[PDB]
Design a binder for this molecule. Structure first.
Ligand SMILES: N[C@@H](CCCC[NH3+])C(=O)O
Ligand SMILES: N[C@@H](CCCC[NH3+])C(=O)O
Ligand SMILES: C[C@@H](O)[C@H](N)C(=O)O
Ligand SMILES: C[C@@H](O)[C@H](N)C(=O)O
Ligand SMILES: C[C@@H](O)[C@H](N)C(=O)O
Ligand SMILES: C[C@@H](O)[C@H](N)C(=O)O
Lengths: 150, 367, 370, 157
């Protein structure tokens, strides 16, 4: 039903969060058009459900970060804030068929609890469990997953 | 060449379909290939056997469950074997690569009990087979569901990860597990129909090895089989996330997707099969009372619509086009999930067909 | 206190019936017995499997038929094992590929053992393990003095000898498979024919009629067969090897020969008759009629409206009056005896199939089997 | 399944020839034997032409002469003649499930012809193949069947 092949780490991205985007057709688009037209190639994109407003966060190369802010900053007049992080780190467990084995996702979490590392962001699928954490927590984070899962 | 074939239960429904399959097996042999076949049990048998087991014993011991499902597949193994023999060819039934290879060298068609898909891909991995064909009622993997998108067309080529991504987010064509082994080793697959001359869809490339030009937007997938559960007011503390998913794991709730972004508290949303939804809510409402979360929400009309394509990895345009496409058909993006190579949004199920059309139209899928 | 139990396909046709069988198994153990169980495939699964085989490859290989019917049986075995385990007993499954050895080992640990035909396997096992009984469960609660549809006041037999059961099975009865009863006779393994749908103790097939005292020896049953054709070969020369020509030719054509009869030579020629399934009657006549040419015999008759009615019972072995009563009973309803054959404890007669029901009815009442 | 081969030289054989094939006629024969306390075993009635048939039966040798006298005192009924044989031998292959294996019956008859013993009467079923021969031919018939069916066991009988 499932299989778990390896872990990945990454400290090349920055995280930018646009707070208070009004939950309405077309508003997500406004944030990504700008970025796209300035040729910032984006990776992770995340939004949860919700003033009835919600927030979007995306990651991009750190090299492009400040510049991604500028394009969002100078065109902020329909969002309340835009944050920059640039000290973020991504750890992913890779595999396939994890939906029928929910223990995997539980164990992923519990693995980081036991090395005392706080999960800032989560986005999973049947083939990948990814979390953003403090970049300095990576080596621990990664190590702990190997012991948990082997 | 050496070709491995997997046939699902639909393809093996009745004696008539079993002959159709045996005709294909032998045709493949007769074109001058070594041939090894993996068969599922006959149409629905396996989940009929899962029903019966559970009625006979609510928690069936895995040791007797191995006998039950093995036996149901053995009747498929014999019936295909007898059928191949009726058409002149020789069959050898197996219930490791080293002994299959001998029978292969003798020129027999090897039939091996299956999961079937993983059995097949493994066998293709071990023997260094040229291709592993998966035979069901679908003749390919399309750019969208044709019952939904009139302009949906058949792919001829697709990378390993591209397929996994689609398999993860809608497509029920292959079991993900089998595809991971596919890519883990370098095992080409192709999705074909038991009743057609059509080559089908080759799933063959690692997307890293893809020549840029061919790294395009591949397809659009749809999933209306899931519920969304949302847990509010979770303290931002190590081990709080473990609290929720240990609870769900214990009650065998299948988790597909979880999203967390950022009163010093955050929210966790996750996605599960609709039939799990209710028991997921029953579990989580209990824990709410004890000094933990402020609320837990339920939604069984969610739909997931996704765009997958190796082409989005290094191209600054695609998210904004995804967004603009749904905007211009007036559908509201409720949730956004991604991977390097896929964008997935949650919206109302009633907007799913309209959304699939829009994405499919926006990105020039269907020519 | 060892007890082998074979459960028919009717006893295991659904989850409910499987669970209900597991309790009976587990109850038999709790009563102080070690239990070994043999299962047929569920309900009409084997027939379904056979139909699917015959659709896919007529005359299919035996090593693909063995694999097909073992799998049908394996479904039941797995389900029954799961069932037993929900009732808190231990079960180890087996394939013939095992022996007394590995079974008796599991029995001593107090494990219920679930293990090339099913009836024959059960009786084989009982024999090897030296069992007190081999019980055969199905939806019929015993063996009766006649077919209840035909004879309405037919009674369940309390007990029966091996050869009495064997003899009835030879001429109409189809409860136990013949070779399994023969196995029981040779290895002296008591059988119990009983229902899995009730608590009725069924019928004991136990002794040899050799060791029934003459005074306890009685008449057991009336049996009927309307599935045969009668073929008669006339003018066979009375010389060694002439009988062989007939049967080699029938055997080479796989024609099932039941009952063959030849009476004393009385021209320099005799005649031979034999019954066969009505399905075979046509092929049998073609083979024989084209060997009539070449002078091997003067003619060959065919008759497919013949019924067989028999009376069996160790009682007739030592008792002079029975053939007389039998013939007299049929004469007094108006049925003509066309053919007669016998065994030590059985009278069989061929009559018009139209007269068959009334013949069984007449025999049954004359010997007061009710 | 073939269990064994049995022999018997304990029986006489008697035949009534030309019995009218009409209800009640067999009854007359056997009533008379029954009333004279003659315990019979085998009975064979096969072919009709005259429209009459014959009935042969076996009974213990010590009752043969009585049996044939009873029947002779009731001849002309209908009958041509009553025969009496005091030197009949009986060989049987005992087993089970022989209908679906017609080879067995064929191999039975082949065994005896290859030893040149003539088969005088036959009576078979799913669990027994029995012939009557010259008691004279018993040894050769038995031996021949033991060798054909790989048995050597007489346990059957
Ligand atoms: N490279 C794409 C990212 C799509 C989101 C999936 N990683 C873009 O810039 O729009
Ligand atoms: N001895 C009994 C049985 C008849 C022959 C059956 N073998 C009788 O005289 O009627
Ligand atoms: C995603 C969010 O921005 C909004 N629901 C939209 O459709 O644009
Ligand atoms: C799940 C997340 O909100 C929490 N901080 C954790 O690390 O467990
Ligand atoms: C008539 C037939 O039985 C012949 N006496 C033979 O032995 O072959
Ligand atoms: C027995 C037979 O010869 C005769 N037809 C009868 O029924 O008596």
């Amino acid at each position: 039903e499932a299989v778990l092949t390896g872990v990945a780490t990454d400290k090349s991205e920055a995280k930018v969060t646009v707070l208070g985007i009004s939950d309405k057709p077309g508003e997500a688009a406004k944030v990504f058009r700008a970025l796209a037209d300035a040729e910032i190639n984006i990776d992770m994109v995340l939004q949860n459900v919700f003033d009835g407003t919600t927030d979007i966060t995306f990651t991009c190369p750190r090299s492009d970060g400040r510049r991604a802010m500028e394009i969002l900053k100078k065109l902020q007049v329909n969002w309340t804030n835009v944050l920059y992080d640039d000290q973020v780190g991504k750890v992913s467990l890779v595999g396939a068929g994890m939906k029928s084995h929910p223990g995997v996702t539980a164990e992923f979490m519990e693995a980081l609890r036991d090395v005392n590392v706080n999960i800032e962001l989560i986005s999973t699928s049947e083939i990948r469990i990814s979390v953003l954490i403090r970049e300095d927590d990576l080596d621990a984070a990664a190590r702990a997953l190997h012991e948990q899962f082997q | 060449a050496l070709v491995v074939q997997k046939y699902g239960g639909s393809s093996l429904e009745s004696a008539e379909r079993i002959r159709n399959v045996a005709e294909r097996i032998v045709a493949t042999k007769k074109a001058g290939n070594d041939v090894v076949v993996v068969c599922s049990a006959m149409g629905d048998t396996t989940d009929e056997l899962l029903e019966l087991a559970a009625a006979v014993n609510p928690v069936p011991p895995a040791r007797e469950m191995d006998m039950l499902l093995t036996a149901g597949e053995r009747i498929s193994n014999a019936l295909v074997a007898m059928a191949i023999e009726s058409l002149g060819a020789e069959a050898q039934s197996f219930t490791t690569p080293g002994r299959v290879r001998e029978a292969l060298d003798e020129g027999k068609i090897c039939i091996v009990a299956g999961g079937s898909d993983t059995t097949a891909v493994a066998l293709a991995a071990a023997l260094n087979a040229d291709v592993c064909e998966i035979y069901s009622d679908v003749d390919g993997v399309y750019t969208a569901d044709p019952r939904i998108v009139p302009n949906a067309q058949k792919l001829e080529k697709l990378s390993f990860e591209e397929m996994l991504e689609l398999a993860a987010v809608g497509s029920k064509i292959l079991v993900l597990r089998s595809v991971e082994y596919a890519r883990a080793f370098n095992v080409p697959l192709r999705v074909r129909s038991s009743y057609s001359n059509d080559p089908g869809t080759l799933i063959a490339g690692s997307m890293e090895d893809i020549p840029v030009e061919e790294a395009v937007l591949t397809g659009v997938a749809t999933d209306k089989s899931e519920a969304k559960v949302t847990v509010l007011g979770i303290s931002d503390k190590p081990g709080e996330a473990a609290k929720v998913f240990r609870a769900l794991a214990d009650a065998e709730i299948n988790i597909d997707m979880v999203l967390q972004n950022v009163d010093g508290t955050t929210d966790i949303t996750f996605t599960c099969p609709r039939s799990d939804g209710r028991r997921a809510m029953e579990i989580l409402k209990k824990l709410q009372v004890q000094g933990n979360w402020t609320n837990v929400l339920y939604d069984d009309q969610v739909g997931k619509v996704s765009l997958v394509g190796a082409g989005m990895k290094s191209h600054p345009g695609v998210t904004a086009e995804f967004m603009e496409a749904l905007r211009d058909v007036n559908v509201n993006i409720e949730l956004i999930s991604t991977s390097e190579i896929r964008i997935s949004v949650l919206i109302r199920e009633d907007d799913l067909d309209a959304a699939a059309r829009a994405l499919h139209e926006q990105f020039q899928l269907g020519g």
